[PDB]
Amino acid sequence: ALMTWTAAEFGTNVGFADDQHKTIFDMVNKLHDTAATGNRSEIGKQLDALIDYVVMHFKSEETEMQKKGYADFAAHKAEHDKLVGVCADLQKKFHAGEAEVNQDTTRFVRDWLVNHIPKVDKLYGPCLSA
Ligand SMILES: [Fe+2]
Ligand SMILES: [Fe+2]
C-alpha cells in the first residue's frame, strides 16, 4: 500500500540491496496499515521488526562499501546513523508510552527512503556491482 518498489525509481544495480529495499518497503507497508488502528501491541511488534531489519540493511551496505573502498562511505554511513538515532528515539518513547506511532511515522520513513535510495544508494552501484 503505502510504498511501491520499481527499478526505475529505486534500482541500484546491486542485487542484495535491491532485495533488502523490497523487504523494507513490505515491512513499512505492514506497519502503515496497522498504524491506522488502535492495536498498539501489533504496532509495536511491527515497528520493532522493521527497525531491526533497517539496521541490518544499513550494516550490510556499510560493510560492502567500506570493504571496497567506496568513495562516499563515511558520508553515506552518517546518513544511516542519523536515521537509526531517530528510530531508536522513537522506540524509546513509544515503548515508554510517551509517543504514538501513526501514519505520519510511516510516511516519514517512506519520505526518508524515497529520497535516500535514489540520491544516496544509487551512487554506490558502479562500485558495488563491479
Ligand atoms: Fe539502502
Ligand atoms: Fe543507504
Swiss-Prot record:
Query: What does the annotation say about its assembly with partners?
Result: Monomer.
Q: Which residues does the record give as Fe cation 2 binding sites?
A: 61, 76, 80, 116, 121
Recorded hits in InterPro entries, A to Z, give: Haemerythrin_Fe_BS, Hemerythrin, Hemerythrin-like, Hemerythrin-like_sf, Hemerythrin_metal-bd
Q: What's this chain's function?
A: Oxygen-binding protein. May be involved in a storage mechanism or for delivery to oxygen-requiring enzymes. The oxygen-binding site contains two iron atoms.
- Residue ranges crossing the lipid bilayer per the database entry: none
Q: Which NCBIfam families match?
A: bact_hemeryth, hemeryth_dom
Taxonomically, which superkingdom? Bacteria
Naturally occurring in which organism (per UniProt): Methylococcus capsulatus (strain ATCC 33009 / NCIMB 11132 / Bath)
PANTHER family, per the entry: BACTERIOHEMERYTHRIN
Gene3D superfamilies found in the cross-reference section: Hemerythrin-like
GO terms assigned for molecular function: metal ion binding; oxygen carrier activity
- Protein name, per record: Bacteriohemerythrin
Residues that coordinate or bind Fe cation 1: 21, 57, 61, 121
The family classification in the record reads: Belongs to the hemerythrin family.
